[PDB]
Design a binder for this molecule. Sequence first.
Ligand code: ACO
Ligand code: ACO
Lengths: 174, 173
Amino acid sequence: PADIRRATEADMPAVCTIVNHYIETSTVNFRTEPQEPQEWTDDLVRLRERYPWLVAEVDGEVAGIAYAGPWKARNAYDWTAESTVYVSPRHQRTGLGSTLYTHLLKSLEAQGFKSVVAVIGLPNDPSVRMHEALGYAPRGMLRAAGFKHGNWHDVGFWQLDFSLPVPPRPVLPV
Amino acid sequence: ADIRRATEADMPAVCTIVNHYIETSTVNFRTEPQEPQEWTDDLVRLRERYPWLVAEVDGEVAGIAYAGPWKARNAYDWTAESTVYVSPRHQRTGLGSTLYTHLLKSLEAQGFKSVVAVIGLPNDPSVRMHEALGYAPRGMLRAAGFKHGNWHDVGFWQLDFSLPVPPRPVLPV
Ligand SMILES: CC(=O)SCCNC(=O)CCNC(=O)[C@H](O)C(C)(C)COP(=O)(O)OP(=O)(O)OC[C@H]1O[C@@H](n2cnc3c(N)ncnc32)[C@H](O)[C@@H]1OP(=O)(O)O
Ligand SMILES: CC(=O)SCCNC(=O)CCNC(=O)[C@H](O)C(C)(C)COP(=O)(O)OP(=O)(O)OC[C@H]1O[C@@H](n2cnc3c(N)ncnc32)[C@H](O)[C@@H]1OP(=O)(O)O
């Protein structure tokens, strides 16, 4: 059993620990410096009313995070969100990522977003397969765009499209 | 015509050119006019590590091509973004491609790995110019922007260089 719920400030140290592990050990993101919980909490409090920030809690512990934010700082992009998801290494492939994203995506759809973009450093078969299983389509890839872990890595963009009319209404808060 | 390094004195004229396209076109997805200070700030911050070039015709700024960081992670340090705008008075007289030729020669010699151009679509003139200079289409987000009454796709084009593994730091201009 798992509670997918809105993330709180108290969850952020655990989230920071999870994501830092992947920063250190994975090329799925191209960060090469760990983050501090303060940055996570600052971002949460700044964005959580506009974008869904969700955690999966299992047996009282934070086991995963999924969150959205703006894609690019232009008004024209207001209906385009970025999504991110990390599940604790002890909790992989138990459906948490899917559940987190289903809740995330349903929120963004109801809020009136046009689409959601996922940036995936490659190769990362689990993330690619999970994103495609949830309806994201591969939209292209920049070759050898990042140097991390001693090699050049491609970065791919996946996108899940919603239907909106012309013109779109301003998006709703969470 | 002159192809030379961009200076702070050029920035109001550049800002005026790009603001015209912001106002009248969807070739970029900004909706609000920019102030020249935004241009000056980026020029001052970037001009030592990235080429910023202006075309000058009959003594007036006629276009700009400039590069900057693709993304603010150190892993992207060898990946540049390129951008080019020519005044509507000076379109299709070789300035854009000449500017880019110089820009690209610099980025290659400085030791970048690749250059990425972001093209709000449709923009046949820009796609044609980029592909003629060796950029390859690398993908496209659908309906990523809403501007001037319609959804617009945005495409990414990339020109690849080659570097050893590991790369050395990029050289300054
Ligand atoms: C956020 C971005 O845009 S990129 C960063 C993605 N995050 C990471 O790479 C961190 C490390 N990995 C993870 O956190 C997780 O593996 C995630 C988030 C990629 C996937 O979440 P999980 O909870 O493990 O996946 P979940 O159990 O919901 O599986 C959903 C579907 O995704 C696919 N899938 C998931 N994991 C794998 C895997 N190792 N190999 C192949 N397919 C997989 C499968 O289709 C799976 O369905 P199935 O189990 O019925 O066969
Ligand atoms: C910056 C980015 O990554 S996207 C934003 C690009 N900037 C803009 O769209 C602003 C408005 N347009 C412009 O400033 C210019 O038209 C640019 C920058 C796209 C091209 O610069 P120009 O100086 O006009 O191009 P230039 O004269 O060097 O022509 C080079 C090639 O580009 C193509 N091209 C340029 N203009 C056109 C046009 N109207 N129609 C079709 N093809 C064109 C052609 O292949 C041309 O080669 P050719 O003349 O031998 O047939």
